Amino acid sequence: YRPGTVALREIRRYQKSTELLIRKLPFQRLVREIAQDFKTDLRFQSSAVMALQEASEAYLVALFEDTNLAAIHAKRVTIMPKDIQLARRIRGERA
Amino acid sequence: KKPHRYRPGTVALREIRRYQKSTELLIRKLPFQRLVREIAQDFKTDLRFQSSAVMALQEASEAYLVALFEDTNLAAIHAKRVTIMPKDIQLARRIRGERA
Amino acid sequence: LRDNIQGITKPAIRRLARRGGVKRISGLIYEETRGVLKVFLENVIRDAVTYTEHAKRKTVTAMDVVYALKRQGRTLYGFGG
Amino acid sequence: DNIQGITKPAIRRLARRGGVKRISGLIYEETRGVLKVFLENVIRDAVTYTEHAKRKTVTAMDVVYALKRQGRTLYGFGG
Amino acid sequence: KESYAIYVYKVLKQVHPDTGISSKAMSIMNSFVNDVFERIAGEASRLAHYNKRSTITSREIQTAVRLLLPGELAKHAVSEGTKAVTKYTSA
Amino acid sequence: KTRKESYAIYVYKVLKQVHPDTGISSKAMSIMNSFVNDVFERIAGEASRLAHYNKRSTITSREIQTAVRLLLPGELAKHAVSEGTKAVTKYTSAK
Amino acid sequence: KTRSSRAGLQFPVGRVHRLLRKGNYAERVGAGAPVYLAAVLEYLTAEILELAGNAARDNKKTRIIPRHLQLAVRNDEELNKLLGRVTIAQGGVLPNIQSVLLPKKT
Amino acid sequence: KTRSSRAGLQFPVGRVHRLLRKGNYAERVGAGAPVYLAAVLEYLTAEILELAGNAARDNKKTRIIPRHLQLAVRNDEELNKLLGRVTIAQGGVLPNIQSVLLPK
DNA sequence: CAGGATGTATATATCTGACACGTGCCTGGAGACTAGGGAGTAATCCCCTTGGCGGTTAAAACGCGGGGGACAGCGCGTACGTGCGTTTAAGCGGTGCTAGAGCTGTCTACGACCAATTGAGCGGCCTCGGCACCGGGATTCTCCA
DNA sequence: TGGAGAATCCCGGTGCCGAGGCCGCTCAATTGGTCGTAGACAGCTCTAGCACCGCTTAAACGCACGTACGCGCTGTCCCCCGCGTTTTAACCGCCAAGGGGATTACTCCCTAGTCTCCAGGCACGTGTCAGATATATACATCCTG
């Protein structure tokens, strides 16, 4: 069993890549079932739902990078959701 | 002991209560006036200032510093600590978007 | 009905955190991260549905979504034209 | 020289309002530096606001719109 | 040299008929009301610009206050405003 | 049928001006298009803001170089006012 | 008569109309748009001095200092989410100390 | 002839003029304002496209992909300062790894 | 628990200058009146969105074993903290002043409005080669004996 | 240390569809003229900023010491990482149908713009009382006991 280095190996595999990360049809069903709340039998466009894809990816990797720096300040390599709480508190979304 | 000595932390609690109670002036304003005139003639000399202007920048700096200091405080509690380090305020400046 | 928000998966979250650059990830962060993404989707999608509803439209084109992320200053490129 | 005029008990009072008991000794000078960066940006926007409309003095309206440009809008001084 | 003094003063007299207000708080009030004024008017101008509709009217500003304020206050202000415009178009 | 207005072939000409052996993509063309009218929106809106400050109906080169003072970093801005003054003097010297 | 009295509102509809006319938002202005403007701003200031009068009432003063404005904005969650990026002048900071900040064992 | 050739520019003085006319940002305009606007957009597009060409040529690429313009913006300080609150479509992420997570 | 020992909430005596009311003069607010193009409304057509099924196959779910990080506890060094005396220059009062912001007025040039004129520009259709993909070998480094 | 293998980098062919490039049509760009209307500038008014001077005085400044918190060490436990088999369900290409976006065409309303009258809103003056300040007393803490 090969420990540790495969994590940094896929770090380097994913930081050069440009492909999409959330698989698109779960997200497509998600935006359908959340837009069912506001207005029923509502319609979409493919460019629009890729726009939600791109915005969600950019926001989430910004969140995860801030979480990494929170963990480095915590003297930990493991991320824990109170770092998510701090990173949302930083943007003023919580307070 | 014969002379009264408050243990540390309690008078710190007294000062945070006393300073969150009131809205009185905090940063002393004439060194701030010398500071803005210093920066003003650093850019372009023979510039004049209004009093309402200088209290406007003074209150804006007060608000920015109390928000930054509360955020770096809660970062210090997040670091399993009760003291703020400079690396806490480095994290505050980096995370808030003001540095990167 | 269904789960839907559980339609996204945990290896997708390891990919997303792996673009951010981590090494070790806790197993309890997934539900909270899904909730964060859900309320972010709330904050964009509400502006999206009223922007669709204003202009006699029941179909969301891309451009009003570009306006929706423009609204809170998280503007996106490559779709405004 | 006068940047050091923002004194250490004033930073202590600011920390007491912000919510801190224990402060470090290396805090205050770099706090003065980042505060100076903040007034650098605000004063650049204020001086180009002053110079655009041909006055040689700074009122309160233009520094309020300068913080409006910076996203730190302030009430109580017009605008 | 105009302000928003006496309309908000008699609004305060209508809601809380036994209180006063200092000049600093009135400056806070005036800066608040003109700030939300230019915010909501800029959103209305963007809304008129967006869908090549060069006239600003009640439906567009209704959508603008849908965007500006969060949910509960948005429905309350929208309902109060349409009852006000219904009273106006009846009168 | 209608005229989809874009800025594509113009920066194609400036691309062949600066780098004669590089192509463009349609997607890259979309980020270029969205970027250029986005800067146009902020520069013209902030010029409108400075027009409304001075209570004038007349807008010209000087509040727009003040807007280059505002929404630009310093050295890029002073290169930009140099470029703008060079272009407007080349225009105004055309007898 | 006045359009404010015709709509039963308080803010001047004609003043709002000409300020939005000369604030070059659009070159065509509809009829009920300044009425809707006046209604939503009077609703907003109704909540602001509602909470301000309450905060003065629990502070045994009758003249409103902007401290009462600060406890008006920062205590309502929806209105704090709306206008929380706005700095209120001489408003102070709320009393908020964490539980791991005060000493333990009473 | 045209105002683009009279100003020695490629961006349209006439079209930028007409857009800012019916974009009702102000009641009336001078003559030098669309020339100035065309000049500053020309400079910013030329600078970003030069950085994108450099980012293409060290990666031996001749068709410009969004990865290259993301390299153009995020590796330059004043482009980070002015392009701060944006999202680049299909552009990836700047490589940055902390030395703590690096082994040994 | 417990007693004393201090900072602080309360309580009325008092004083003052901002706060709200009154006056009236005046510039926007409203009523009346005309007109024309923006948009309401309706009808047409066609992109383009949704649905759905089947072969393929990459990716997810789950189980297992372990080793390295998260955390609890500890122990020792000194960093501010608290409180005293010490030294400083902010702050109120008071006044001289002068410098530049604002109002008034008047000429003027340039920019919006209109018509007419035409090629820059933009969709449409054709062509080729840059690069993604299939397949294979050379190169690194990582972990086991 | 030496060696096995697991992925990454490079290398070559290829086939395609995405980008380049040329083409025909037309709508916005341009040429030219007018008229008025904010802009430029100058002259005057005067407000608000600037600046020395002393005096009491709050507040900064400096130091001792001590304590309890910052930080390194260590040990333990179990939490994820990593691999592998089984399972999941999504990609793509295909075919059908229609709701709704997009455009055109007509008509009328209501909103831009002028004129005229008028009153509400704002500069100015005011006298007064809510709240700042003061000092003695209860009370609610904390620290050694």
Author numbering:
A (entry chain A): 42 to 136
B (entry chain E): 37 to 136
C (entry chain B): 23 to 103
D (entry chain F): 25 to 103
E (entry chain D): 32 to 122
F (entry chain H): 29 to 123
G (entry chain C): 16 to 121
H (entry chain G): 16 to 119
What's in the article?
Unlike other chromatin remodelers, INO80 preferentially mobilizes hexasomes, which can form during transcription. Here, we report cryogenic-electron microscopy (cryo-EM) structures of endogenously purified S. cerevisiae INO80 bound to a hexasome and a nucleosome. We group subunits of the INO80 complex into four modules: Rvb module (Rvb1/Rvb2), Arp8 module (Arp8/Arp4/Actin/Ies4 and Taf14), Ino80 module (Ino80/Ies2) and Arp5 module (Arp5/Ies6). The Ino80 protein consists of three major regions: the N-terminal domain (NTD), the HSA region (Ino80HSA) and the ATPase domain (Ino80ATPase).
In contrast, the states of INO80 bound to a nucleosome have Ino80ATPase bound near either SHL-6 or −7 consistent with previous findings. All Ino80ATPase locations on hexasomes are different than on nucleosomes, which are near SHL-6 or SHL-7 (12-14). Also as previously proposed, our findings are consistent with the possibility that Ino80ATPase acts near SHL-6 when sliding nucleosomes. We found that a gap at SHL-6 inhibits INO80’s sliding activity on nucleosomes by ~ 200-fold but so did a gap at SHL-2. The pause could represent the reorientation of Ino80ATPase from SHL-6/−7 towards SHL-2 and add a step that slows remodeling of nucleosomes compared to hexasomes.
